[PDB]
Design a protein around this ligand. Sequence first.
Ligand SMILES: [Fe+3]
Ligand SMILES: [Fe+3]
Ligand SMILES: [Fe+3]
Lengths: 178, 178, 178, 178
Amino acid sequence: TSQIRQNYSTEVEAAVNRLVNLHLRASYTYLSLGFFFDRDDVALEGVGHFFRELAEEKREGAERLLEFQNDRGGRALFQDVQKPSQDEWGKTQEAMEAALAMEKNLNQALLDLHALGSARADPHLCDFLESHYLDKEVKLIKKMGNHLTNLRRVASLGEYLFERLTLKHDGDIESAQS
Amino acid sequence: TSQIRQNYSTEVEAAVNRLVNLHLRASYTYLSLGFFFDRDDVALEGVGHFFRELAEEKREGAERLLEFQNDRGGRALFQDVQKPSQDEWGKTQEAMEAALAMEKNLNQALLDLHALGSARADPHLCDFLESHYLDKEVKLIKKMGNHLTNLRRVASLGEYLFERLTLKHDGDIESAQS
Amino acid sequence: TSQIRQNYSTEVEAAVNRLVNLHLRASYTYLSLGFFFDRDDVALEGVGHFFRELAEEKREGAERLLEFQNDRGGRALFQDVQKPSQDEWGKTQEAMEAALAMEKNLNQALLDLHALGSARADPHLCDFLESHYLDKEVKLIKKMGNHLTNLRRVASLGEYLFERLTLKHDGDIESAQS
Amino acid sequence: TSQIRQNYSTEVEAAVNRLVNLHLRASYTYLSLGFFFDRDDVALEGVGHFFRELAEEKREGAERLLEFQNDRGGRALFQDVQKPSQDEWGKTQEAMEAALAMEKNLNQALLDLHALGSARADPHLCDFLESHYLDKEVKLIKKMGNHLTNLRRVASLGEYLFERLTLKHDGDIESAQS
Ligand SMILES: [Fe+3]
Ligand SMILES: [Fe+3]
Ligand SMILES: [Fe+3]
């Protein structure tokens, strides 16, 4: 009924609303992780900052899907952001596997959205995804896999050394380009 | 027969030629609108400048489709640019609805071209469209819908106030980034 | 059991966890509002940006309470961020009253936390609140009351004029000091 | 009997004098620690510099309490700064636990002073503490807890690696902002 709504199926409009809730829940989990590794009894502040500046990006990916919902004339329907899966994540390895299994699951939702959009012949949606989400997500998953193998390589002196030499070293340059 | 022609169906080559004529006719209509709101008896110079810098962009979108026709090895076939629909557009609201119904119709042609190109498996054409036309067009339609609802909100002191506070305010920053 | 936990009652640690969920839910509501006033059929982009840069600040107030939970040695317990109350907010006036009734309710929670903290003789908590939350909140409520009376004064040409002359005028200077 | 003495109970004036002696004794202990880790047979110069620039801050906290004693019209009564508890501190871990148990004990004295000051309705004293001592102390204790868990994580190659990668890395930036 919107005046600007054109070639925007309701199945896509609803599949997008379930994708913003996924991004928000994924930003909530990363927020929980980033505030778990700054606890006094873990103190892996490099990992904490990594997950923190990851929640920033996930939430930004959520509001970029909402402004796309408005540009196409859809109606944003919010749902309850379900709480993270765990409150204790454990060693950084068992946490980065719970953060990679959440990306590979969030990336699967993006691929299903792109499959749905190509099924209803929505070129603008497929372009928007291809441009803003898919490549970022495969690069993030690649980075997490690198972190995971480096963590299995130093497997807890090795975990401290990893947080100091890899994660902190990149957190320093984030604060430089920021 | 062109030496560089590769994977460029004649159905796409002809559908593109009908799309440059559409862009040219749409730039002609915007040219008529931009010189209607600078008439002495309308004097909505903000609306005039808006439609003027819109005709610039539509024409640029036409010559970007022609240089794509050359890159792919097609032959540009020009047709008579049919004159605009009206010579009197009336109040700015009834003109911005005749300018939005022309975008949503020009955007439909782009989507049909992208559907045809995906039917003949022309990835370069779909990428070219997705990159240069589709997103620009949905953003322009969104902007026009915003203008339309703001015009219905002030519905003629309100029309003058709108031209002064929205359109002129953005024309000033166009002349800044220009 | 934490090594750094000192003079940090569990009643405060739990009352803080219910305050971060309040801040997150309040940032979720403001996110819903900021993406409701950029809808094509409302197009009060000034109000949209106001609520958007308000959700930023509410969420920042949430992660500043979480890092305080870590500094004092508490354990952050996340809960389901309940979805906003409405999906349609209506005119900007009826939305700014639902955004002020949410501040005066979020400010009441801060005052109850400060009363609890003073009951258990926690000076650091009362100082943290007094410094970072209370004054910001009374200033924000004052600003919202100003907006509300200015909206009742122009009571829909007046609503457009308000969004153009008050909210947009301050959004321009936000983007300047930002 | 002082002309400027107003709302400054003698119980607070005496409790402050016992707090400057505590700060001085704590700066004496940190001075002993900072000159123990530069011994030729320990040579953890990063830890040495950490405790050294910690004694600076503790002593500064002592003379900031003395100038507050003068501003309120009290009389500074000095006592014998009792010598540090140990002359051999051992491994850096067993020293950072003797330096954290001294902070959590110095922070307890500040909280007792703030409880006494609130008992005699001395708002200026509670504000002075809340502003200058309490938050600094909880942040320092948090930092020490981080150091302690990182030291237990690398638990003596790990101790050298810690001193090199954490403590020296921050000593370099101290000498930059200094
Ligand atoms: Fe593409
Ligand atoms: Fe107080
Ligand atoms: Fe205070």
